[PDB]
Symmetry: D2
Amino acid sequence: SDAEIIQLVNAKHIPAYKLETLIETHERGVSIRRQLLSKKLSEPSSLQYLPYRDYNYSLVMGACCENVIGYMPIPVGVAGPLCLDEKEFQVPMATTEGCLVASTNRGCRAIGLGGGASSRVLADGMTRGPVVRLPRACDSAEVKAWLETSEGFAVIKEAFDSTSRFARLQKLHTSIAGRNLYIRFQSRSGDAMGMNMISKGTEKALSKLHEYFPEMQILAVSGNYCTDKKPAAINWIEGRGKSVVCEAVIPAKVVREVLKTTTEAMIEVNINKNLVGSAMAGSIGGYNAHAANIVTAIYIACGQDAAQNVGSSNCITLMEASGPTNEDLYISCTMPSIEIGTVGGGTNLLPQQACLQMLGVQGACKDNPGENARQLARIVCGTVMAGELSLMAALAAG
Amino acid sequence: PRPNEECLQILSDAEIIQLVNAKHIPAYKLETLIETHERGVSIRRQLLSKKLSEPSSLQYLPYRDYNYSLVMGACCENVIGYMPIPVGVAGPLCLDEKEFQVPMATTEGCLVASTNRGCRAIGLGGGASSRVLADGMTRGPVVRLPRACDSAEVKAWLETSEGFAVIKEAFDSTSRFARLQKLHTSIAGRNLYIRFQSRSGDAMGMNMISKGTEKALSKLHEYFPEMQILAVSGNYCTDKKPAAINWIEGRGKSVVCEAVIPAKVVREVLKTTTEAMIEVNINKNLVGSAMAGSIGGYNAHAANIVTAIYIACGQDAAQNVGSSNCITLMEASGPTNEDLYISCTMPSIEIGTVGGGTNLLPQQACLQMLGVQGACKDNPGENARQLARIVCGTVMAGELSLMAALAAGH
Amino acid sequence: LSDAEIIQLVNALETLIETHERGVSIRRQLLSKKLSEPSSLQYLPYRDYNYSLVMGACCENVIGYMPIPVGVAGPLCLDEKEFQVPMATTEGCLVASTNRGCRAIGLGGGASSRVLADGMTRGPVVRLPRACDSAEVKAWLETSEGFAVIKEAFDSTSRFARLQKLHTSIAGRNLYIRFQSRSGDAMGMNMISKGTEKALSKLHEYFPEMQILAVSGNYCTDKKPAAINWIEGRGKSVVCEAVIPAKVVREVLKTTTEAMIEVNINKNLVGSAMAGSIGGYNAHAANIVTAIYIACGQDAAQNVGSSNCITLMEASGPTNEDLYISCTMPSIEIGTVGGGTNLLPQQACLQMLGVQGACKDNPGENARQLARIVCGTVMAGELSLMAALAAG
Amino acid sequence: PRPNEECLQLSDAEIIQLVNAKHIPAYKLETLIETHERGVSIRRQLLSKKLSEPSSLQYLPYRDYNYSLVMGACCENVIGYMPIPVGVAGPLCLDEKEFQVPMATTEGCLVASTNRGCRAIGLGGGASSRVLADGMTRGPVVRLPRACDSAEVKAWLETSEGFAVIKEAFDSTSRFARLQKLHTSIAGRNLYIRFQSRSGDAMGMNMISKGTEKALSKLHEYFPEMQILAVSGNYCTDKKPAAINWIEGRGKSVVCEAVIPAKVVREVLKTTTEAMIEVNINKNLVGSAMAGSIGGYNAHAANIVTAIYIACGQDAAQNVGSSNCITLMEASGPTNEDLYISCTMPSIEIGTVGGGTNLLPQQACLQMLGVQGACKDNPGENARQLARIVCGTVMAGELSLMAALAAG
Ligand SMILES: COCc1c(C(C)C)nc(C(C)C)c(CC[C@@H](O)C[C@@H](O)CC(=O)O)c1-c1ccc(F)cc1
Ligand SMILES: COCc1c(C(C)C)nc(C(C)C)c(CC[C@@H](O)C[C@@H](O)CC(=O)O)c1-c1ccc(F)cc1
Ligand SMILES: COCc1c(C(C)C)nc(C(C)C)c(CC[C@@H](O)C[C@@H](O)CC(=O)O)c1-c1ccc(F)cc1
Ligand SMILES: COCc1c(C(C)C)nc(C(C)C)c(CC[C@@H](O)C[C@@H](O)CC(=O)O)c1-c1ccc(F)cc1
Ligand SMILES: Nc1ncnc2c1ncn2[C@@H]1O[C@H](COP(=O)(O)OP(=O)(O)O)[C@@H](O)[C@H]1O
Ligand SMILES: Nc1ncnc2c1ncn2[C@@H]1O[C@H](COP(=O)(O)OP(=O)(O)O)[C@@H](O)[C@H]1O
Ligand SMILES: Nc1ncnc2c1ncn2[C@@H]1O[C@H](COP(=O)(O)OP(=O)(O)O)[C@@H](O)[C@H]1O
Ligand SMILES: Nc1ncnc2c1ncn2[C@@H]1O[C@H](COP(=O)(O)OP(=O)(O)O)[C@@H](O)[C@H]1O
Ligand SMILES: Nc1ncnc2c1ncn2[C@@H]1O[C@H](COP(=O)(O)OP(=O)(O)O)[C@@H](O)[C@H]1O
Ligand SMILES: Nc1ncnc2c1ncn2[C@@H]1O[C@H](COP(=O)(O)OP(=O)(O)O)[C@@H](O)[C@H]1O
C-alpha cells in the first residue's frame, strides 16, 4: 500500500525519482511522489490543485520529463481561418495572456478579406557549433583551410551523413579565435527539429577529423556557435532551422473597417517602433512588435521546444503604402531562424499531436520528408504576420 | 432536430450548431449563449471539427473538467480545450539558507534530471547565495515633436527636478504600487523615446505600467501640446524582443547568484574537474558567444530553466526572450585552487506572482509549492523577488550540470 | 661632432643632441640601416617642422611626418552661422560630395542642432571576494551619501572634473563602474582617469577587500564598438536637422524626396538591421568624422564610437514633397584643448572654425560647438551620398 | 591692380578680382590657372576673407607639396596639408622576418608602449600569423514586386548555373575581379546581395563596385521586374559597425600569436602571466560583454590600426570595421608560467595600390615595410603581408597596454 511504500522509501535506499522503476504503474508512481513531496513543503496542501490523474504518462516517462508530479494545463485557443498559400488553417494557440488569441484572430480576418497571404521557405537546416582546440593558431588555421578544400569537406560530409538517413551535411561555416576553432555544422533533418540527430552527426564528423589532426582536442560538442537558445547575430545573419518570409496586401477599406486605422498611420508606427525604436534599443533581430507571443503560443500547443522561442522569434516586420492611390497596406514578416519539427520531442505526445493534426502537419510526411515541418514554419510565419497586423493597428489607433 | 424559429427560446446540441451556422453567430460568443462553460467549448470544438481535413484531429485534445471560469474574459479566447505539459520537480535547491522544491514544466528529456543533479552539487557545497540588484518593470513609448529642437527641449524638461516631479505625480496617481523610479530618454531626430521604470508590487506589472505611462504622457502633453503620441510602446522597453537596453539597464528584476562547489563534489557528483569546467565556460560561454555575436547570451542554457519554471508558475512564457539574459562565470577557488566558484548574473527577469496566468489554480499550486503565491501582505513585491531569486538559483544549478557533462565530453 | 660620429657612439636622442631637427635626421639614418630599402625614407618629409610641441607629448621615435591633403567644404549654414569645414582625407570626391551637401542645406534655409548630453566616461573593473559583497558595493554607490563621497573625491582632482552620474553593472563578484563627467573643452580621457583613480582609492577605504583589477574594464567603452555608448551616450550626444525644398532636391541633389526616403529606409534602417548593426544606421558618417578629426587634431582612433549615427528622412511641407532630414550622434568624443590640438597646424583648422583652445568664458562651449559642426557636416555628407545612390 | 576686362592673359589680386566678379567656384582654380601650388595659394586667400580670423590659415602648411598626385584623385578644394607625426616601433619579429612599423599619431606613449610590446615578442622567439580569408565586399539592395519574387531571385542565385553567369558578368570588368561566394538575405520584397571578391593588392571598393554594377545589370536581364535601389544597401558593410563583418569577414581575416617567457613578462612587461590573464578575461571578454560589444573584445586595436593606416595611405575611416579584434591570453609552458597570446582580426580592409597609397610620402612608409604597390609575380601578397603586419603590431600593442593595466 501507499503508506507502506512511503515508509519503505523514507528508509533512504530508494530516492523519490526511482519510483517509476519500483512501483508497477505510472499514475501511482506520481501519486506516491506527490505525497512524499507534500511533507517537505511549508504548505503540505499546495499540490491540491495541480492535476495528475488520467494522463497518458506512458509516452512521458523516460522520454520527455523526470520526477513527474503531474501536469500543467495551458488554455488552448483558436485563431483563424488563416488564408495562407491558397489554403485555410485553424491555428491552435496555448496561452494565458488575455486578448492574444482574439487580436491574432482579428489579424487573420484582415488578411482573409485581403485575398490571403503568401509565404516561401528560403532555407532549411538545423545547426550545431562545437568548439575544438589545436596547440597553435597556425594549426587551427591549417584545419580551417583543410575543411575548406573540396576533399576535406567530402570526407567530413561522408562521416556526418553515415549516422542517419536524414543527415545531409549542407555547408560548413568555421570561425577561428586564436588556437580555438568553432565549426558550425548545418544539415536538414526530415521533419524533426533535429537537435539530437545533428549532434550524432557532429560527434562522428569530429572523430573522423581527429584522425587527420590527432592533436585536436574536442572541448565541447557545443561551443555556443550554433547558436542554440541564446540570442546571437549568427542565427539572424546565416539562419538556423527554417528561414521564412510571408506577405500580404490589405485593402484600404479593410484597414479602415477591420483594423480601425489607416495605412499611413500603420506605416508610421511600424517605421518608428519596429525599425527606429528597435535600433535605439540596440536590438539584433528584434525588429517586430510581438512575434514572440505568437511563436510561444503555437510552440506550446504543438509540442515544440518553447525555450527555442529565443531565436525562433527573430523577425523583421515591414510595411509599405501600396495600390492605385497608395492607401493599401503591404506587409511582410521575415523570420530567418524558426527552429521547429513535427516528429520527436513533445510532438510524440497525444494532446500536442492533436494540435498538429488540426494543422495537417503531424508526424513524418512520408512522400516528401521535411514538408510537414516546413509547412508548420510557414504557418508560424503567417500567424506572426496576422499578430503584427492586429497589434500594430491597435497601437496606431491609440 | 427542430427548426430555427422554435429554437429562439433558451436546447439541443445539434440545434445550437444549426442556429450558429444559420444566424451566422461567431463561435467566440458561445460562452454567452450556452448554459455551462464546458459545453460552450464542446460546441466550439464540434463547429471547428467540420472545418478540418481530419475531422477527428481534436480527439485527444483534453477539454473536460477544466476550470474555465477563471480563463474566460481573462486569459484566453475561442477556447477549445487545454494543453497538458508534464511537470517535474528538481531539488532541494539550497538558496539563501532555505530549501526549495522547484516545479519545471517541460517536454525535453533529461532537463529536470540534469537540473536536479546541479541542485545536489550545490547542496553538498554548502548552498547558494543570491541578491536582487534592481527591481522595475518598464514601458518605452515613442512620441514625436515637430522638430528635433523641440524633442530636445522635451528631453531637457523631463530631466529637470521639477519636470520629473510633475510626471512622477501623474504616473503615481494611477495605482498604489506605481512608483516612478527613473526616466531614460533617447532622441532620434524629432522622435523621443521615453523609458518609464517602476516597481509594481508582486505583479509582473505590464498593465500597471501602461496605465501609468498613459496618464504621464497625457500630463506631458499639457506642457507640450504639439507632442504627438505615436505609440504607447515604441520598442524601447524593450518587451519580448532581444535588446541591448534590457541587458545594460536591466528590466524587471536584476539578480545575481553564486556558489562554491568543493573539488570532491565536482569529481563525484559532476564527474569532472574544476579546471575542465573553467576551460569550457570561458571558451563556450564567453569566447563562443562572442564569436556568435551575442548580446546577453553568455550562458549555456538559461532559457531551458527559465521556460520550464515560467510555464509551471503561470508566467508569460514569451518573456523568456529577455528573461533568459545571463552571464555565467566560473573560477578556481579555495586553499589549493581546486574548488569551483560559479556565478550567474541575470539583469532582466520579468516575473510576477499576481495576475495573468498566476490567477489560475494549477499554476497557483506550483507557486505555493515555492511559497510565493499571490501578494505579499507585509512586504509588497517580496514574493516576486523571491521567485526571481529562485529562477536565478535554478539556472545556476542548470548551468553547473550541463557544463559538467560537456566538460566530461565522452 | 659629425653625424657618423654620433651614430658610431650610439651603436657602441633629443636628450643628448642640441637641435630637434637633427635628432630626427640621426634616427632616420640609424633606422635606415635596418631596412631592406634604405632609400624609401627619402620621400618621407621631416624638415621645417617644429618637433618642440611633439617631443614628450604626442609621439616617440619620430622619423618625420605624414602629410594628409586638407580640403574645405562649405559654407555650412548651422544655427544661423556659417562654417568653412576643414577635411583631411585621401579619398577622392569626399570633400566635393560633402560640399554639395552643404549647398543643398544652405539653399534650404540652413540646419539646426542641439547638444543633448555632455560627458566623457571611464569604466574600470573592480573585484570583491563574493557577489554578495559586489552587490553591497553597488547598493552603496547608488545611495545619495555614497555618490556624494565618491563625487567629492573625483571632483577634487581638477577644476574641470565634475562627476555627473554613476552607472554600475555586476558580473558575479566583478563590478564595472562607469564614471561620467564633463571636462571643459578637453576630450577628457586623462582628466577622467585621474578622477577615477582618486575615486576608486576612496571607495577602497570603505571596502578594503576590493581589488582594483584595471582602471579600464572596457565598460567605458573607449575605441571599441559597444551598445553602451549608443544607448547611454559618451562625450557629446548631438542631433542635427534640416528641410530641403523639393526644388533643391531636384536641381542640386539630382533626385526626388520620395527616392531619397526609400533609399534611407531600406539602406540605413533595414539594411543595417539585416547586417546586425548596433549604432550604424547611416551611410558614411565615419568618412566625415574621420576627415574632420584628422584635420582638427582629434584622436582619429575614436572614429570607432564617434561615428555612431542614425540618419532619418521623411516627407515634409504643404505638398509633402520637401525633404526632412535628421542625424543623431550619441557619442562624439571630441576636444579643442590637449593632445593633437596642441600642435600649430591642427590649431589652424580649429581657428578656421573659431573653436580653438579653451573657451575661457564658458568651458566646454568650444568643444560643444565642434561637436555640432561635426554632426552638421555628417548630415551634409549623408544628404549628398544618399542623393547619388537614389539617382544611380 | 589692373582692370578686370583686360586680364585674360596677371597677378594674384587679379585672379581674385575675376573670381569674385563672375562668381567662379574655387574648385575651378585647378583648371583656370596653369600651375598647382598657385591655385592652392589663391583658394586660401579667397577663404581667408570668409573667416572671423583671416589669420587662421597662417600655420596650415601648403608649400612645397606634390599636388599633382592629389588633384583629381585624392582631395578637392585643397587649402594645404596636415602633418601627422610619424614614429617607428620595432623590430617586429613576425613569421621569421623583422619589420620596422611606421605609426602616424598624436597620442603620447602610443608608439613607445607599442615598441615595448614588440620587444617582449622579440625576446619570446617572435610571432606567427596566418591569413584565413581574403575578399572585399559590396552589398547592394534590390527590390522585387513581391517577397515571392525576391525568394525566386535568391533561389536562382543559389544554383550553380545562376551563379556562373553572375560570376562571369562580374569577372569581365577587371583582371583581378574574381567573384567568390554570394551571401543573400531577404527582408520581405527586398533582397540584399553581398558580393565578395579578391582584388589583387588593391583594397577593392571601386573594382568591386564595377563588378557589382555589371552583375546587377546582368541579373536585370533574367528579372526585368527587379529594381536596383542602391549599389550599397549597408549589407557590405562598409564603415559602420556590423555583426556581418565580424562573423563572415571582410577584406582580410587574420590571426596572430606568440608565447612570452615568464622572465620576459616579469622584466620587460613588469607583471606576471597570471595577472595578465586575469585582466584579459575580465576586461576584454567579460567587460566587452557587459558593454554589449560586437567585435570589440580587445584593449586598443583601433589605436594601432589607425596609426598604421594614416602612415601607409589607407582609408582611415575603415578603422571602424578593420579594428574588429578578439584578444586571448592563456597560461603556457612546462611550469604553466609562460604567456600565450593571440589576436584574431576578421575584417582588416587594406591595400597597397590605389587611393592614398599613390602618394609619395605614404609610399615611403609602405616601402619601409617592403609592401609598396603591386606584387608582380604573386598578386595580393603585398596587401596580405600588410594585413599580417597590422595584426602583429596590434598584438604587440595589446601585450604592452594589458601589462600596464595588470601591474596597476
Ligand atoms: C492598447 O493595447 C494594445 C495591446 C493589445 C490590443 C490588440 C488588444 N493587445 C496586446 C496583447 C493581448 C497581444 C497588447 C500587449 C502585448 C504584449 O504581450 C507585448 C508588447 O508589450 C510588445 C511591445 O509592443 O513592446 C497590447 C499592448 C501593447 C503595448 C502596450 F504598451 C500596451 C498594450
Ligand atoms: C552530452 O550531452 C549533454 C547534454 C545534456 C546532459 C547533461 C544530459 N543535457 C541536455 C539537456 C537535457 C539539458 C543537453 C541539451 C540541451 C539543449 O536544450 C540546449 C543546448 O543545445 C545549449 C547549448 O549548449 O548550446 C545536452 C547537450 C548539450 C549540447 C549538445 F551539443 C548536445 C547535448
Ligand atoms: C555612385 O557613386 C556614389 C558615391 C559617391 C558620390 C557622391 C560621388 N561618393 C562616394 C565617396 C567619395 C563619399 C562613394 C563611396 C563612399 C565610401 O567611402 C563609403 C560607402 O561605401 C558607404 C556605404 O554607402 O556603404 C560613393 C559610392 C558609395 C557606395 C557604392 F557602392 C559606390 C559608390
Ligand atoms: C596607466 O596607463 C596605461 C595606459 C598606457 C601605458 C602603456 C602608458 N598607454 C595608453 C596609450 C598611450 C596607448 C593608455 C590609453 C589608451 C587609450 O588610447 C585607449 C584605452 O582607453 C582603451 C581601454 O583600455 O579601454 C593607457 C591607459 C588605458 C586605460 C586607462 F584607463 C588609462 C590609461
Ligand atoms: N472574444 C473574441 N474571440 C475571438 N476573436 C475575437 C474576440 N473579440 C474580438 N475578436 C476578433 O476581433 C475582431 C473585432 O471584433 P469586435 O471588437 O467585436 O469589433 P467589430 O464588431 O467592429 O469587428 C473580430 O472580427 C474577431 O476576429
Ligand atoms: N520523416 C522523418 N523526419 C524526421 N525524423 C524522422 C522521420 N521518420 C522517422 N524519423 C525518426 O525520428 C528521429 C527524430 O526525433 P528525436 O530523436 O526525438 O530528435 P529531435 O527531437 O532532436 O529532432 C530521427 O532520428 C528518426 O529516427
Ligand atoms: N531520473 C532522474 N530524476 C531526477 N534526478 C536524476 C535522475 N537521474 C539522475 N538524477 C540526478 O543525477 C544525480 C546522479 O545520479 P546517477 O545518474 O544515478 O549517478 P551516480 O550514481 O554516479 O551519482 C542524482 O543525484 C540526481 O540528482
Ligand atoms: N571639385 C569640387 N570641389 C568642391 N565642390 C565640388 C566639386 N565638384 C562639385 N562640387 C559640389 O558639387 C555640386 C555639383 O556640381 P557639379 O559637379 O559641377 O555638377 P552639376 O553642376 O551637374 O550639379 C556643386 O554645387 C559643388 O558645391
Ligand atoms: N578649458 C579647459 N578645458 C579642459 N582642460 C583645460 C582647460 N584649460 C586648461 N586645461 C588643461 O588641459 C588638460 C587637458 O589635457 P590632457 O591632460 O592632455 O587630457 P585630454 O586627454 O582630455 O586632452 C587639463 O588637465 C587642464 O590642466
Ligand atoms: N596587382 C594589382 N592589384 C590590384 N589592382 C591593381 C594591380 N595592378 C594594377 N592595379 C590597378 O589599380 C586599381 C586599384 O586602385 P583603385 O581603382 O583606386 O581601387 P581601390 O583603391 O578602391 O582598391 C585596380 O582597379 C587596377 O586598375
